[PDB]
Design a protein around this ligand. Structure first.
Ligand SMILES: *[C@@H]1O[C@H](CO)[C@@H](O)[C@H](O)[C@H]1NC(C)=O
Ligand SMILES: *[C@@H]1O[C@H](CO)[C@@H](O)[C@H](O)[C@H]1NC(C)=O
Ligand SMILES: *[C@@H]1O[C@H](CO)[C@@H](O)[C@H](O)[C@H]1NC(C)=O
Ligand SMILES: *[C@@H]1O[C@H](CO)[C@@H](O)[C@H](O)[C@H]1NC(C)=O
Ligand SMILES: *[C@@H]1O[C@H](CO)[C@@H](O)[C@H](O)[C@H]1NC(C)=O
Ligand SMILES: *[C@@H]1O[C@H](CO)[C@@H](O)[C@H](O)[C@H]1NC(C)=O
Ligand SMILES: *[C@@H]1O[C@H](CO)[C@@H](O)[C@H](O)[C@H]1NC(C)=O
Ligand SMILES: *[C@@H]1O[C@H](CO)[C@@H](O)[C@H](O)[C@H]1NC(C)=O
Ligand SMILES: *[C@@H]1O[C@H](CO)[C@@H](O)[C@H](O)[C@H]1NC(C)=O
Ligand SMILES: *[C@@H]1O[C@H](CO)[C@@H](O)[C@H](O)[C@H]1NC(C)=O
Lengths: 451, 415, 197, 49
């Protein structure tokens, strides 16, 4: 396997590379938040309305009480995970009826009021990409009563004492929370995460975001149309990537697959003999006397108890993993959506500007808007400049040379300027700095005094 | 359930509810013959060990209590079925065998047994069901000169399969020299008589053995026991008995297409899904009766003694084992209001319950996410704060838990 | 408020309570008391009953140890979070949003608690907002003036420059503004004067 | 100083050693060797062991 391309960057002790353009990139991070809540009845699973089996099952103490307690703790923890990820805003902020945010097009993440469930286009795509297992959040005993074609997997799952509890928050409330977070982020910036919502125009908010990462705010006010066009193209590319490839949502589908497969194995383990002469309990009751059928029922009880304990243990381990992922998703919601992050590779790849949450089945989807430098150029650089026996260092920025003249420019964008005492400070003489060059430093007071 | 006298505010799962069946349904095929067990157990001389007879028994009602009145046997040793409950279930094939053996080879007739009779004369399968009537025959199979009417074979060249015979007599050879029909060197006839005499020990007396074999219900049934049938009723939670299998469910009509050799229908967990009526050619589905979980919703016992009951995941027009249908079952004892507060007690998909004054009562409501706000957005408008507040907030985090140790020898055994 | 540490105490009490209570089960034997089986039977039958009791008690002990391992993993994750919060709230100042309290973080004070720690997060919350009209730049003598730090606001007649998180209005000066370009590229630039000292 | 990676090595060595040592137990049977159970008993008793 290939680790990657081979690169040899041209390091030198007076050579620097400074970008002259940029690009705006919108990435996508998918995180699971909650999983399926299940409740299992012991007496219906192990015995199934057999009184003799229940009487011998009562001699094993309080195993089924602690299995019921463990499953109840898991089911409470899932709702706690969803509450601590999504319910972070205090008011349901509403987007204004106008649709001008400085040229940025948000019409594909804002909700559509035409459909009943107020979900966006990307939310609808993410809901259609994950094939739901038609779980117990809708009652199905009326459908299981009417036998159509063959026996369903879900009906045979529910007929053996396995029940799936619906989540506390419906998808409408998750979508409403996501719309509130989106409206607050678009309208008020990061001010709604630290108190009241203070309104600000979107171009000025984006200029604050550019000033956060080290680029001066006149870059946005000169390149607003280009940055808006790049953002709209990135949003369209996100839509095309979600419509084309369905393999990006593998984590939520993995959660659904594991939650179905564990219950399928639990149902399948009821057909085993475990050393008995038969697996059906009624045949053992209707074929043998009291003592020998008590021996066979004891074997079946021990086998089914072991299988149920294994299911509860793997559910506990998976719940711990999902809880760690939900803690990460809550941290990402608090730090990317509600603010601006200086942490590298947190909140996307690049220099982080914004983020937009989207709701998904059993999880959340983040759209990390970032800043990427594009077109670099080679320059000759110096640490300081000697002038009149004094060493001048830049205030913010870097000294560059195009071959004949020396300029001062910022770090992440090529905007050269005349070297002046306004943008430089003086510290010491020229005999201490290694690599100091000779140039003149312009004084604004000299032509004003002579005029 | 909580093992306490004061409960707190919340929702607690107490027990489960099961709809009880009312009637009992017994179905059996119609037969009137009696299986002739009386004509087999008594004879002047039984068949030999190598020529044991086979009787095909089918299409008759078999009363097995009459076998105790036909022979004074000691051990009615059975393996796969208890001898007291053959009148209830039904089978598809009943066999019968008859041979007379020695008193030292009575225990050789067993599944997974080796020896002389069990290896070369009469081998039973390892999955054998049904059992054996064996009793002493020193009265009728003894002579002062000895009984020479029964033959057994010593050994053969290999092993012998279960339910296999060997009638022909051949001279055994254990060398390269040919026997040529003459019992010479390394040539012995493998058949010799028992020689039953009253002067031997107690372990060599002749015995009469009758072996019965059963076949489980893997086919349409022919042989049954004495049991009165019952009329068929459907769309009601009953206790059906279709050819010896018991169960509980709601029998309905079916649209499944069955092959003419098919009579059953199984599930993934090896549970019967459909069944064929032994009387008429109609296929009936089996669906178990309604059930679920019961959750009790209460405030504290210091506040009130009122409760609300949630029956999880049922359409509760069938509730008798304020009624409001939720997505998580339906709620009894609490009324639904068209308001929205914070969630006090969580019930299900967006529904919560609490204890409010509008006389105290327990009410159910759809929970409210938060206050509606519409911040005024404009492209030349900003809002800047002019004052501030200083807030102190408490966050609590666990760090460590209780360190425990165990001693296995004193926990499991106790010195 | 302190339900988490109370739950930490209650779980470790309940696990030991059910581990003691599991000694009363028979697990298919004739009695749960070992001395009664040892006195009431011969060697082989008592060996059978002791084998049943040993199997049941070993299964209960294994269940207890597995549950304790999972709870210890969760407690260790919470302790790692508490150590990170001690390193980042108390020992410094945190720029992470909704870490170290809700608002703009200033200080934090640890407090000891049974089986845990309690943090007192001191934060800054803005209180009294006020509407102002704003502009991205100021056009003066064919030049675009952008603020070095802050925002241009107007009360209706006069344009000032003030900081973002507090209302401290100041006259627009070349000391608190910088110039880059002209008034033909910025959308929404307004006309005003800039005081030269 | 490098005790954590050494603990990672040692735990996975010790668990496999314990899993190998668990084959020597009788678990209430008459012998820990499967072949001696199959050769020293009949079908039913050896099936129980
Ligand atoms: C700077 O780099 C050049 C070649 O890249 C090298 O010859 C020179 O020694 C370096 N300067 C110092 C002070 O080592
Ligand atoms: C935003 O994009 C959608 C399709 O991508 C388009 O229909 C809509 O007109 C755009 N918004 C504006 C304001 O042009
Ligand atoms: C800069 O110089 C290096 C080597 O001197 C060269 O490979 C590269 O193409 C130049 N240009 C840029 C934009 O890096
Ligand atoms: C810079 O100028 C000074 C005097 O003008 C001179 O002494 C010094 O050598 C010059 N620096 C270099 C690198 O030549
Ligand atoms: C059994 O019942 C069916 C239908 O009731 C009938 O056709 C058949 O002749 C009956 N057979 C006997 C032996 O009574
Ligand atoms: C044995 O069975 C025959 C019928 O085959 C009967 O005539 C005879 O009386 C029976 N004898 C005894 C002792 O039961
Ligand atoms: C199930 O409950 C719904 C709730 O309104 C009801 O409309 C429907 O008729 C019920 N189904 C039945 C009774 O089969
Ligand atoms: C700014 O807002 C006003 C009022 O809503 C609107 O009429 C105007 O078109 C907006 N400016 C631009 C450039 O769209
Ligand atoms: C600011 O203007 C909006 C829109 O007219 C108004 O609703 C609000 O009360 C005003 N004042 C403040 C302090 O936001
Ligand atoms: C600002 O002043 C210039 C001339 O000084 C004029 O051309 C321009 O239209 C003015 N802009 C506004 C918005 O009044």
């Amino acid at each position: 396997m290939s680790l990657g391309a081979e690169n040899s960057v041209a390091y030198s002790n007076n050579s620097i590379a400074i970008p002259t353009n940029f690009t705006i990139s919108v990435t996508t991070e998918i995180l699971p938040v909650s999983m399926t809540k299940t409740s299992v009845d012991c007496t219906m699973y192990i015995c199934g309305d057999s009184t003799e089996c229940s009487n011998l099952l009562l001699q094993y103490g309080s195993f089924c009480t602690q299995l019921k307690r463990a499953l109840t703790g898991i089911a409470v923890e899932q709702d706690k995970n969803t509450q601590e990820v999504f319910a972070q805003v205090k008011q349901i902020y509403k987007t204004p009826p106008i649709k001008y945010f400085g040229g940025f097009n948000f019409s594909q993440i804002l909700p559509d009021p035409s459909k009943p469930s107020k979900r966006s286009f990307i939310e609808d795509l993410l809901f259609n990409k994950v094939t739901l297992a038609d779980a117990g959040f809708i009652k199905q005993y009326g459908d299981c009563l009417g036998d159509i074609a063959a026996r369903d997997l879900i009906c045979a799952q529910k007929f053996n004492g396995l029940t799936v509890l619906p989540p506390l928050l419906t998808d409408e409330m998750i979508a409403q929370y996501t719309s509130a977070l989106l409206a607050g982020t678009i309208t008020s910036g990061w001010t709604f995460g630290a108190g009241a919502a203070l309104q600000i125009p979107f171009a000025m908010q984006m200029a604050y975001r550019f000033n956060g990462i080290g680029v001066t705010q006149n870059v946005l006010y000169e390149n607003q149309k280009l940055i808006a066009n790049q953002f709209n193209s990135a949003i369209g590319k996100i839509q095309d990537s979600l419509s084309s490839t369905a393999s990006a949502l593998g984590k939520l589908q993995d959660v659904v697959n594991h939650n179905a497969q564990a219950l399928n194995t639990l149902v399948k383990q009821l057909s085993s003999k475990f050393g008995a002469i038969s697996s059906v309990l009624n045949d053992i009751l209707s074929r043998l006397d009291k003592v020998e059928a008590e021996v066979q029922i004891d074997r079946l009880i021990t086998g089914r108890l072991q299988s149920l304990q294994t299911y509860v243990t793997q559910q506990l381990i998976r719940a711990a993993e999902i809880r760690a992922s939900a803690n990460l998703a809550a941290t990402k919601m608090s730090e990317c959506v509600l603010g601006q992050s200086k942490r590298v590779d947190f909140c996307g790849k690049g220099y982080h500007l914004m983020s937009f949450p989207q709701s998904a089945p059993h999880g959340v989807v983040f759209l990390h808007v970032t800043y990427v430098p594009a077109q670099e150029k080679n320059f000759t650089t110096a640490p300081a400049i000697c002038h009149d026996g004094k060493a001048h260092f830049p205030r913010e920025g870097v000294f560059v040379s195009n071959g004949t003249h020396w300029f001062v420019t910022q770090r992440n964008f090529y905007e050269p300027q005349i070297i002046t005492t306004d943008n430089t400070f003086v510290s010491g003489n020229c005999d201490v700095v290694i690599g100091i060059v000779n140039n003149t430093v312009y004084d604004p007071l000299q032509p004003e005094l002579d005029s | 359930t909580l093992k306490s006298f004061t409960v707190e505010k919340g929702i607690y799962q107490t027990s489960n509810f099961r709809v009880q069946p009312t009637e009992s349904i017994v179905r059996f095929p119609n037969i009137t013959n009696l299986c002739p067990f009386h004509e087999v157990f008594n004879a002047t001389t039984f068949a030999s060990v190598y020529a044991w007879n086979r009787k095909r028994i089918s299409n008759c009602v078999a009363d097995y209590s009459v076998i105790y009145n036909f022979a004074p046997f000691f051990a009615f040793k059975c393996y796969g079925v208890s001898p007291t409950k053959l009148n209830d279930l039904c089978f598809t094939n009943v066999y019968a065998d008859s041979f007379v053996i020695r008193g030292n080879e009575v225990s050789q007739i067993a599944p997974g047994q080796t020896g002389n009779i069990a290896d070369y004369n009469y081998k039973l399968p390892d999955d054998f069901t049904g059992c054996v009537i064996a009793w002493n025959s020193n009265k009728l199979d003894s002579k002062p000169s000895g009984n020479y009417n029964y033959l057994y074979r010593l050994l053969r060249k290999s092993k012998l399969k279960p339910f296999e015979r060997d009638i022909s007599t051949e001279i055994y050879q254990a060398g390269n020299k040919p026997c040529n029909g003459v019992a010479g060197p390394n040539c012995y006839s493998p058949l010799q008589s028992y020689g039953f005499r009253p002067t031997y020990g107690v372990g060599h007396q002749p015995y009469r053995v009758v072996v019965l074999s059963f076949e489980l219900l893997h086919a349409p049934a022919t042989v049954c026991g004495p049991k009165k049938s019952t009329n068929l009723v459907k769309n009601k939670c009953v206790n059906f008995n279709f050819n010896g299998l018991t169960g509980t469910g709601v029998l309905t009509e079916s649209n499944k297409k069955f092959l003419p050799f098919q009579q059953f229908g199984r599930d993934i967990a090896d549970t019967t899904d459909a069944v064929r009526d032994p009387q008429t050619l109609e296929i009936l589905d089996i669906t178990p009766c309604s059930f679920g979980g019961v959750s009790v919703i209460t405030p504290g016992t210091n506040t009130s003694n009122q409760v609300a009951v949630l029956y999880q995941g049922v359409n509760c027009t069938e509730v008798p084992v304020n009624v409001f249908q939720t997505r998580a079952g339906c709620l009894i004892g609490a009324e639904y209001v068209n308001n929205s507060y914070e969630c006090d007690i969580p019930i299900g998909a967006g529904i919560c319950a609490s204890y409010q004054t509008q006389s105290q009562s327990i009410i159910a409501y759809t929970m409210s996410l938060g206050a509606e706000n519409s911040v005024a957005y404009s492209n030349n408008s900003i809002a800047i704060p002019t004052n501030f507040t200083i807030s102190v907030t408490t966050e609590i985090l666990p760090v460590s838990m209780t360190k425990t140790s165990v001693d296995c020898t004193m926990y499991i055994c106790g010195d």
